[PDB]
Amino acid sequence: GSDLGKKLLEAARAGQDDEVRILLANGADVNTADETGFTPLHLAAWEGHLGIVEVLLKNGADVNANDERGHTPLHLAAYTGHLEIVEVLLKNGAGVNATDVIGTAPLHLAAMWGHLEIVEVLLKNGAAVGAQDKFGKTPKDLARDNGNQWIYELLEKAEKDLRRKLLEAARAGHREEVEKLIKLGADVNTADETGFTPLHLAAWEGHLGIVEVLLKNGADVNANDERGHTPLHLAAYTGHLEIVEVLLKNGAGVNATDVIGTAPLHLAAMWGHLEIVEVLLKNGAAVGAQDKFGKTPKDLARDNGNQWIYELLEKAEKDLRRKLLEAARAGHREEVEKLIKLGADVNTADETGFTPLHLAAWEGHLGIVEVLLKNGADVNANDERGHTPLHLAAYTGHLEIVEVLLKNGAGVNATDVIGTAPLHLAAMWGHLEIVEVLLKNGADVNAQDKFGKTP
C-alpha cells in the first residue's frame, strides 16, 4: 500500500530515525525487499546506521535475510567495517557462517579489509576459519593477499587451536566436540610430534563413533606416525575388532609394514586377538610376511602361547598351498598370481611330492609355468617318483614348456628313481620336435636306466 516499503527503504539509507519509527507505526512491512533483495536491515547495516538497525530488529526484521546474491546484513556490516553493528546482528541471531553465491562468509570480508576487531568478534561467535570460497581462498589466505599481517597470525593461531582441541577431543571420546571442531574448520589430518592423527587416537582409545566421523570427513585411513604404525596397526594391537572392520571397509591397507617390518597380522597374532586374525585373513592379509627380525605371524602366535591362532595360521598356510596347486592344474593364471601375493609357498609339495611347477608342466599350462619361475620355483624339483618338471614336459609333449624349463636351468640328464631321463620319455611318445631340443643342451644319449635301455 502506497509503497510504504520503498519509503521505508529510502529512509533506512538516509538515516531518518524518526521516519522509520513512524513508517513502521503505520504498518509498513519490516521485511520489504529491493529488486536486488536489499531490505531495510541490509541498507541500515550497509550505510552504517546503528540506531535504525536496532529499531528494525525490534519490529521483527529478518536478521538472516538473503538478497539475490546471498549477502546477509552481517556481510555488509563486515564488509564496510561497522563493528558495533556486527555485534548487534550476532546478538540477535545473525548467521556468522552465512555464505553468499561465491561461498564468501563474513570472516572472508573482515580478513580482506583489515577489520581486526570484527575478526575477533566473528571468532568469538563461532566463525569457521576453515571456510573456503569458490575460488579456494580462506579468510587466512585473504589476510595475506591484502597485507593484513596481524589478522593472519590471529587466524593462524585459531587454526592451531582447533587442531589441538581435535587431538584431545578424539582421545577423550567426545564424539560431540569433534563434530563441532570439524564444522569450524579443524584439519582432520593434522598430526602431533610423533605423527599421531585424530584417527590414530580415536582408534587407539577405542572410540568407534569418532573413527566413523573422521573417515566420514576425509581422514587419511593410512596415516602413519614416526614408527610407521597406521590406525589399523593400533586397532590390531589394542584389539578393537569393530574399529578394524571399519578401517578395512574404508580402504585401510591390510599389509602395511611399520619401521620394524611389523604388519597388522603380526600384532594381532602376538597379542592373542583371534577374531581380528580371522578378519585380517578374510581381507587379504598375507601370511608369509616377515618382520626384519625374520618372524612371521605364525611364529609370534607360537611364541606368545596362542595355539588357537597358531593352528589358524598353520591352516591358512596349508589352505594357501593347496589353492595354489589346484590353480596350477586348472590353468587359472589370474588366480595363481593372486595366491602368490598372499604368501603362497611356491615350493610346496603334495603327498607324492608334486609341486605347482610339476602340475603346470604336466597339464600343459605354459602361462602358469612362466609365472611360477618368476617367484622362485625349484626348477630342478624332484618328487618321490623321481621326476622333475622337465620329465613331465617331455612325457606329455609341450614343446615350448620344455624350452622355458631348459632356459631356467633344467637338468637335462636328470635321473628318476629307476634312472629314466627326459630323453627316454621324449623318444617313446615320439615328440620329435622335443628330442632335438634336449640334444641342443647335450642330452646324454648313452643314458642307461635300471633296465639298461637307451633312448
Side-chain angles (χ1 to χ4, degrees), residues 184-240:
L184 294 171
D187 293 324
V188 65
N189 289 306
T190 186
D192 58 34
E193 190 67 20
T194 55
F196 293 152
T197 65
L199 188 60
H200 282 110
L201 292 170
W204 170 264
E205 296 293 356
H207 302 307
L208 190 66
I210 297 173
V211 173
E212 296 165 1
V213 178
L214 295 168
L215 300 165
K216 165 182 154 187
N217 291 119
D220 182 25
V221 65
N222 283 316
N224 71 84
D225 66 317
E226 290 279 332
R227 298 193 75 91
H229 300 89
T230 62
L232 178 53
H233 275 107
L234 302 171
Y237 181 97
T238 57
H240 305 299

Coordinates of all heavy atoms in Angstrom, one line a residue, residues 184-240:
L184 N 33.9 -26.3 12.4 CA 34.6 -25.0 12.4 C 35.7 -24.8 11.5 O 36.1 -23.7 11.1 CB 35.1 -24.7 13.9 CG 34.0 -24.6 14.9 CD1 34.6 -24.5 16.3 CD2 33.2 -23.3 14.7
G185 N 36.3 -26.0 11.0 CA 37.4 -25.9 10.0 C 38.6 -26.7 10.4 O 39.7 -26.5 9.8
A186 N 38.5 -27.5 11.5 CA 39.7 -28.2 12.0 C 40.1 -29.2 11.0 O 39.4 -30.0 10.4 CB 39.3 -28.9 13.3
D187 N 41.4 -29.2 10.7 CA 42.0 -30.1 9.7 C 42.0 -31.5 10.3 O 42.7 -31.8 11.3 CB 43.4 -29.7 9.3 CG 43.5 -28.4 8.6 OD1 42.6 -28.2 7.7 OD2 44.4 -27.6 8.8
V188 N 41.3 -32.4 9.6 CA 41.1 -33.8 10.2 C 42.4 -34.6 10.1 O 42.6 -35.6 10.9 CB 40.0 -34.5 9.4 CG1 40.4 -34.7 7.9 CG2 39.6 -35.8 10.0
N189 N 43.3 -34.2 9.2 CA 44.6 -35.0 9.0 C 45.8 -34.4 9.8 O 46.9 -34.8 9.5 CB 44.9 -35.1 7.5 CG 43.9 -36.0 6.8 OD1 43.7 -37.1 7.2 ND2 43.3 -35.4 5.8
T190 N 45.5 -33.5 10.7 CA 46.6 -32.9 11.5 C 47.3 -34.0 12.2 O 46.8 -35.1 12.6 CB 46.1 -31.8 12.4 OG1 47.2 -31.2 13.1 CG2 45.2 -32.4 13.5
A191 N 48.6 -33.8 12.6 CA 49.4 -34.7 13.3 C 50.2 -34.0 14.4 O 50.5 -32.8 14.2 CB 50.3 -35.5 12.4
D192 N 50.6 -34.7 15.4 CA 51.3 -34.1 16.5 C 52.8 -34.4 16.3 O 53.3 -34.6 15.2 CB 50.8 -34.6 17.9 CG 50.8 -36.1 17.9 OD1 51.8 -36.7 17.4 OD2 49.9 -36.7 18.6
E193 N 53.6 -34.4 17.4 CA 55.0 -34.5 17.3 C 55.4 -35.9 16.8 O 56.3 -36.0 15.9 CB 55.7 -34.3 18.7 CG 57.2 -34.2 18.6 CD 57.7 -32.9 17.9 OE1 56.9 -32.0 17.7 OE2 58.9 -32.9 17.4
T194 N 54.8 -36.9 17.3 CA 55.1 -38.3 16.9 C 54.5 -38.7 15.6 O 54.9 -39.7 15.0 CB 54.7 -39.3 18.0 OG1 53.3 -39.1 18.3 CG2 55.5 -39.1 19.3
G195 N 53.5 -38.0 15.1 CA 52.8 -38.3 13.9 C 51.4 -38.8 14.1 O 50.7 -39.0 13.1
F196 N 50.9 -39.0 15.3 CA 49.6 -39.5 15.5 C 48.6 -38.4 15.1 O 48.7 -37.2 15.3 CB 49.3 -39.7 17.0 CG 50.1 -40.9 17.6 CD1 50.4 -40.9 18.9 CD2 50.5 -42.0 16.8 CE1 51.2 -42.0 19.4 CE2 51.2 -43.0 17.3 CZ 51.5 -43.1 18.6
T197 N 47.6 -38.9 14.4 CA 46.4 -38.0 13.9 C 45.2 -38.4 14.8 O 45.2 -39.3 15.5 CB 46.1 -38.3 12.4 OG1 45.7 -39.7 12.3 CG2 47.4 -38.1 11.6
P198 N 44.2 -37.5 14.7 CA 43.0 -37.9 15.5 C 42.5 -39.3 15.2 O 42.1 -40.0 16.2 CB 41.9 -36.9 15.0 CG 42.6 -36.2 13.8 CD 44.0 -36.2 14.1
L199 N 42.7 -39.8 14.0 CA 42.3 -41.2 13.7 C 43.1 -42.2 14.5 O 42.6 -43.2 15.0 CB 42.4 -41.4 12.2 CG 41.8 -42.8 11.7 CD1 40.3 -42.9 12.0 CD2 42.0 -42.9 10.2
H200 N 44.4 -41.9 14.5 CA 45.3 -42.8 15.4 C 44.8 -42.8 16.8 O 44.7 -43.8 17.5 CB 46.7 -42.3 15.3 CG 47.5 -42.7 14.1 ND1 47.8 -41.7 13.1 CD2 48.0 -43.9 13.7 CE1 48.5 -42.4 12.2 NE2 48.6 -43.7 12.5
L201 N 44.4 -41.6 17.4 CA 44.0 -41.5 18.8 C 42.6 -42.2 19.0 O 42.5 -42.9 19.9 CB 44.0 -40.0 19.2 CG 45.3 -39.3 19.3 CD1 45.1 -37.8 19.5 CD2 46.1 -39.9 20.4
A202 N 41.7 -41.9 18.1 CA 40.4 -42.5 18.2 C 40.4 -44.0 18.2 O 39.8 -44.7 19.0 CB 39.4 -42.0 17.2
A203 N 41.2 -44.5 17.2 CA 41.3 -46.0 17.1 C 42.1 -46.6 18.3 O 41.7 -47.7 18.8 CB 42.1 -46.3 15.8
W204 N 43.1 -45.9 18.8 CA 43.9 -46.4 19.9 C 43.0 -46.5 21.2 O 43.0 -47.5 21.9 CB 45.1 -45.5 20.2 CG 45.8 -45.8 21.5 CD1 45.6 -45.2 22.7 CD2 46.8 -46.8 21.7 NE1 46.4 -45.7 23.6 CE2 47.2 -46.7 23.0 CE3 47.4 -47.7 20.9 CZ2 48.1 -47.5 23.6 CZ3 48.3 -48.6 21.4 CH2 48.7 -48.5 22.8
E205 N 42.2 -45.5 21.4 CA 41.4 -45.4 22.7 C 40.1 -46.2 22.5 O 39.3 -46.3 23.5 CB 41.1 -44.0 23.1 CG 42.3 -43.2 23.4 CD 43.0 -43.7 24.7 OE1 42.4 -44.6 25.3 OE2 44.1 -43.2 25.1
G206 N 39.7 -46.7 21.3 CA 38.5 -47.5 21.1 C 37.3 -46.7 21.0 O 36.3 -47.0 21.7
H207 N 37.3 -45.6 20.3 CA 36.1 -44.8 20.1 C 35.6 -45.0 18.6 O 36.0 -44.2 17.7 CB 36.4 -43.3 20.4 CG 37.0 -43.1 21.7 ND1 36.3 -43.5 22.9 CD2 38.1 -42.4 22.2 CE1 37.0 -43.2 23.9 NE2 38.1 -42.5 23.5
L208 N 34.7 -45.9 18.5 CA 34.2 -46.2 17.1 C 33.5 -45.0 16.5 O 33.7 -44.7 15.3 CB 33.3 -47.4 17.2 CG 32.9 -48.0 15.8 CD1 34.1 -48.6 15.1 CD2 31.8 -49.1 16.0
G209 N 32.7 -44.4 17.3 CA 31.9 -43.2 16.7 C 32.8 -42.2 16.2 O 32.6 -41.7 15.1
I210 N 33.8 -41.8 16.9 CA 34.8 -40.8 16.5 C 35.5 -41.2 15.2 O 35.6 -40.5 14.2 CB 35.8 -40.4 17.6 CG1 35.1 -39.8 18.8 CG2 36.9 -39.5 17.0 CD1 36.0 -39.6 20.0
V211 N 35.9 -42.5 15.1 CA 36.5 -43.1 13.9 C 35.6 -42.9 12.7 O 36.0 -42.5 11.6 CB 36.9 -44.5 14.2 CG1 37.4 -45.2 12.9 CG2 38.0 -44.7 15.2
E212 N 34.3 -43.1 12.9 CA 33.3 -43.0 11.8 C 33.2 -41.6 11.3 O 33.1 -41.4 10.1 CB 32.0 -43.6 12.3 CG 31.9 -45.0 12.6 CD 30.7 -45.5 13.4 OE1 29.9 -44.6 13.7 OE2 30.6 -46.6 13.8
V213 N 33.2 -40.6 12.3 CA 33.1 -39.2 11.9 C 34.4 -38.8 11.1 O 34.3 -38.1 10.1 CB 32.9 -38.3 13.1 CG1 32.9 -36.9 12.7 CG2 31.6 -38.7 13.8
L214 N 35.6 -39.2 11.6 CA 36.8 -38.8 11.0 C 36.9 -39.3 9.5 O 37.1 -38.5 8.6 CB 38.0 -39.3 11.8 CG 38.1 -38.7 13.2 CD1 39.2 -39.5 14.0 CD2 38.5 -37.2 13.1
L215 N 36.7 -40.6 9.3 CA 36.7 -41.1 8.0 C 35.6 -40.5 7.1 O 35.7 -40.4 5.9 CB 36.6 -42.6 8.0 CG 37.7 -43.3 8.8 CD1 37.3 -44.8 9.1 CD2 39.0 -43.3 8.0
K216 N 34.4 -40.2 7.8 CA 33.4 -39.5 7.1 C 33.8 -38.1 6.6 O 33.1 -37.6 5.7 CB 32.1 -39.4 8.0 CG 31.0 -38.5 7.6 CD 29.9 -38.5 8.6 CE 29.2 -37.2 8.6 NZ 28.2 -37.1 9.7
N217 N 34.8 -37.5 7.2 CA 35.3 -36.2 6.9 C 36.7 -36.2 6.3 O 37.5 -35.3 6.5 CB 35.2 -35.3 8.1 CG 33.7 -35.0 8.5 OD1 33.3 -35.3 9.6 ND2 33.0 -34.4 7.6
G218 N 37.0 -37.2 5.5 CA 38.3 -37.2 4.8 C 39.5 -37.6 5.5 O 40.6 -37.3 5.0
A219 N 39.4 -38.2 6.7 CA 40.5 -38.6 7.5 C 41.3 -39.6 6.7 O 40.8 -40.5 6.1 CB 40.1 -39.2 8.8
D220 N 42.6 -39.5 6.7 CA 43.5 -40.4 6.0 C 43.6 -41.7 6.7 O 44.2 -41.9 7.7 CB 44.9 -39.8 5.9 CG 45.9 -40.6 5.1 OD1 45.4 -41.4 4.2 OD2 47.1 -40.5 5.3
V221 N 43.0 -42.8 6.1 CA 42.9 -44.1 6.8 C 44.2 -44.8 6.9 O 44.3 -45.7 7.7 CB 41.9 -44.9 6.0 CG1 42.4 -45.3 4.6 CG2 41.5 -46.2 6.7
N222 N 45.2 -44.3 6.1 CA 46.5 -44.9 6.2 C 47.6 -44.0 6.6 O 48.8 -44.1 6.3 CB 46.9 -45.5 4.8 CG 46.2 -46.8 4.5 OD1 46.1 -47.7 5.3 ND2 45.7 -46.9 3.3
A223 N 47.2 -43.0 7.4 CA 48.2 -42.1 8.0 C 49.1 -42.9 8.9 O 48.8 -44.0 9.4 CB 47.5 -41.0 8.9
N224 N 50.4 -42.5 9.1 CA 51.4 -43.2 9.9 C 52.2 -42.3 10.7 O 52.5 -41.1 10.3 CB 52.3 -44.0 9.0 CG 53.3 -43.2 8.2 OD1 54.3 -42.8 8.7 ND2 52.9 -42.9 7.0
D225 N 52.5 -42.7 11.9 CA 53.4 -42.0 12.8 C 54.9 -42.2 12.5 O 55.2 -42.8 11.5 CB 53.1 -42.4 14.3 CG 53.4 -43.8 14.6 OD1 53.2 -44.7 13.7 OD2 54.0 -44.1 15.7
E226 N 55.7 -41.7 13.4 CA 57.2 -41.9 13.1 C 57.5 -43.3 13.1 O 58.4 -43.8 12.3 CB 58.0 -41.2 14.2 CG 57.9 -39.6 14.2 CD 58.9 -39.0 13.2 OE1 59.9 -39.6 12.9 OE2 58.6 -37.9 12.6
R227 N 56.9 -44.2 13.9 CA 57.2 -45.6 14.0 C 56.6 -46.4 12.8 O 56.8 -47.6 12.8 CB 56.7 -46.2 15.3 CG 57.3 -45.6 16.6 CD 57.0 -46.4 17.8 NE 57.8 -47.7 17.8 CZ 59.0 -47.8 18.4 NH1 59.5 -46.8 19.0 NH2 59.6 -49.0 18.4
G228 N 55.9 -45.7 11.9 CA 55.3 -46.4 10.8 C 54.0 -47.0 11.0 O 53.3 -47.5 10.0
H229 N 53.5 -47.1 12.2 CA 52.2 -47.7 12.5 C 51.1 -46.8 11.9 O 51.3 -45.6 11.7 CB 51.9 -47.7 14.0 CG 52.9 -48.6 14.8 ND1 54.1 -48.1 15.3 CD2 52.9 -49.9 15.1 CE1 54.7 -49.1 15.9 NE2 54.0 -50.2 15.8
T230 N 50.1 -47.4 11.4 CA 48.9 -46.8 10.9 C 47.7 -47.0 11.9 O 47.9 -47.7 12.9 CB 48.5 -47.3 9.5 OG1 48.2 -48.7 9.6 CG2 49.6 -47.1 8.6
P231 N 46.6 -46.3 11.7 CA 45.4 -46.6 12.5 C 45.1 -48.1 12.7 O 44.7 -48.6 13.7 CB 44.3 -45.8 11.9 CG 45.0 -44.7 11.2 CD 46.3 -45.3 10.7
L232 N 45.2 -48.8 11.5 CA 44.9 -50.2 11.6 C 45.9 -51.0 12.4 O 45.5 -52.0 13.1 CB 44.8 -50.8 10.2 CG 44.6 -52.3 10.0 CD1 43.3 -52.7 10.8 CD2 44.5 -52.7 8.6
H233 N 47.1 -50.6 12.4 CA 48.1 -51.2 13.4 C 47.6 -51.1 14.8 O 47.6 -52.0 15.5 CB 49.5 -50.5 13.2 CG 50.3 -51.1 12.1 ND1 50.5 -50.5 10.9 CD2 51.0 -52.3 12.0 CE1 51.3 -51.2 10.1 NE2 51.6 -52.3 10.8
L234 N 47.3 -49.8 15.2 CA 46.9 -49.6 16.6 C 45.7 -50.4 17.0 O 45.6 -50.9 18.1 CB 46.7 -48.1 16.8 CG 47.9 -47.2 16.5 CD1 47.5 -45.7 16.6 CD2 49.0 -47.5 17.5
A235 N 44.7 -50.5 16.0 CA 43.5 -51.2 16.3 C 43.8 -52.7 16.5 O 43.1 -53.3 17.4 CB 42.5 -51.0 15.1
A236 N 44.7 -53.3 15.8 CA 45.1 -54.7 16.0 C 45.8 -54.9 17.3 O 45.6 -55.9 18.0 CB 45.9 -55.2 14.8
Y237 N 46.7 -54.0 17.6 CA 47.4 -54.1 18.9 C 46.5 -54.1 20.1 O 46.5 -55.0 20.9 CB 48.4 -52.9 19.0 CG 49.2 -52.8 20.3 CD1 50.5 -53.3 20.3 CD2 48.7 -52.3 21.5 CE1 51.3 -53.3 21.5 CE2 49.5 -52.3 22.6 CZ 50.7 -52.8 22.6 OH 51.5 -52.8 23.8
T238 N 45.6 -53.1 20.1 CA 44.7 -53.0 21.3 C 43.6 -54.1 21.3 O 43.3 -54.6 22.3 CB 44.0 -51.6 21.3 OG1 43.3 -51.4 20.0 CG2 45.0 -50.5 21.4
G239 N 43.0 -54.4 20.1 CA 42.0 -55.4 20.0 C 40.6 -55.0 19.7 O 39.7 -55.8 19.8
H240 N 40.4 -53.7 19.2 CA 39.1 -53.2 18.9 C 38.7 -53.8 17.6 O 39.0 -53.2 16.5 CB 39.1 -51.7 18.9 CG 39.6 -51.1 20.2 ND1 39.0 -51.3 21.4 CD2 40.7 -50.2 20.4 CE1 39.7 -50.6 22.3 NE2 40.7 -50.0 21.8

